[PDB]
């Protein structure tokens, strides 16, 4: 049996994600592909217990579903987690955010690099998120939201709030950019949602400021969000304050999946 | 503490490789990491036992097999991150050491490699199943005309595996300069007759990546100066030996085909 040949991006597509701190891989899963993995979101969901948020979230999902620990080692994402880190990578955390049709709440803005520099001790932003659409991804079901090149300024400040990590995946966020810091960003940079069909892979950078609006639409917006941390970026464990299911501490180098007989 | 990140190969390069089948990169390594794997090698040549081999004339040593199962440099050497991500790269998948070797071409007394391509030993040997393997040769010394580099047929990799004559039963003439699998002359003549012959130079700490198809050859080193190679095989996982169809030991075919994965910084 026969895994197809590793692909990698381009070197215009790495220039690409580089400059913009996003990037957008069109119909990388089929719709059979697909439809395994809402079927395994969907259980995660109703057995999640304490990994899931109120259904808003879920976490951790590749610690505990066979499924979801063989899709973070995929073919399809391995290489190009590897390409773009320039090392070897683990999972540092994994969620799935059903941004559900008619109730689906915000995400502030909020780069992820400030959550788990100051929650997990992740030394610096030398990591990035793979996010599959479970669902198409229009300008009307709350698209994930970039400012393009916001990545490029390191950190940005953000006012705390709990002695707590219970706030870090509210709507509600810990560690959100304020108006007036936003307003800046946006007036020199822009603001992108990217779009794109079911089984497509949004990567974005761990420092790109990003936020989603309400769900307007009829329809959901279903991400399986894989975060690929550079193992030589391993977290501080000793500054770690939260669960393995939301930051993770065993930083074996992921190896690709096998094509096997079973 | 902090590796360098990982390089790759640039489009070009990567063309280069496929359409050639061989490509240098100089000064990987500079001359204190050469220093240790040149004394590193100096321990297996002189306790590798059964894994050494001596050139006919002589006596000398022509060549140590496996080391990175029995070295713990050697074992961190194939994990490098100066050569596993360009392995990985030109592979396509996931990568392990299907064999290594270091092969001393002494100053005055270096004998041939006469004209082979490896995968026909591996395929028939080993049961390598297609030729999704490649070598890294590492230039203990610098590689000149003079000193019996490895010379090969551009692009003659990419006419299959060529038909070549068995020479007896088992393995042991695999590693001489009678080659069990060496090629028919008036092939030889035509591959070389449309595509040339090439003998890639480079300085001390250079690694030349050829394919495991390349036809290639050696002369005789007649200068005063050592040819040190040392010639690590990497292998697709995917395209893992069929360690049924398997003739030969673990130090010259592995069978432990775990993915490589890269040495980091540590403290030690
Ligand atoms: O707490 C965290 O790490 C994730 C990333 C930002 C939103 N929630
Ligand atoms: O026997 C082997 O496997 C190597 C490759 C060709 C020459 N010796
Ligand atoms: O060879």
Not at 100 to 115: I, L, M, N, P, S
């Amino acid at each position: 049996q026969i895994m197809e040949p590793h692909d990698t991006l381009s070197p215009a597509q790495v220039d690409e994600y580089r400059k913009n701190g996003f990037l957008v891989q069109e119909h990388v899963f089929d719709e059979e592909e697909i439809e395994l993995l809402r079927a395994e979101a969907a259980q995660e969901f109703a057995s999640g217990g304490e990994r899931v948020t109120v259904v808003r979230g879920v976490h951790g999902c590749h610690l505990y579903s066979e499924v979801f620990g063989r899709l973070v080692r995929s073919p399809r994402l391995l290489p190009i987690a590897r390409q773009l880190l320039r090392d070897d990578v683990y999972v540092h955390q994994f969620k799935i955010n059903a941004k559900r049709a008619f109730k689906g709440e915000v995400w502030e803005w909020h780069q992820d690099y400030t959550f788990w520099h100051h929650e997990d001790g992740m030394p610096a932003p030398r990591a990035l998120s793979a996010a599959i659409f479970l669902d198409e991804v229009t300008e009307f079901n709350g698209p994930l939201t970039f400012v393009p090149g916001g990545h490029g300024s390191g950190m940005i400040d953000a006012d705390v709030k709990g002695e707590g990590w219970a706030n870090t995946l509210t709507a509600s966020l810990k560690y959100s950019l304020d108006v007036e810091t936003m307003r800046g960003l946006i007036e020199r940079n822009g603001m992108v949602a990217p779009k794109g069909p079911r089984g497509s892979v949004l990567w974005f950078d761990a420092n790109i400021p990003h936020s989603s609006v309400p769900n307007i639409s009829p329809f959901d917006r279903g991400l399986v969000l894989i975060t690929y941390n550079s193992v030589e970026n391993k977290t501080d464990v000793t500054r770690g304050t939260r669960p393995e299911w939301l930051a993770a501490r065993d930083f074996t180098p992921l190896t690709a999946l096998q094509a096997t007989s079973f």
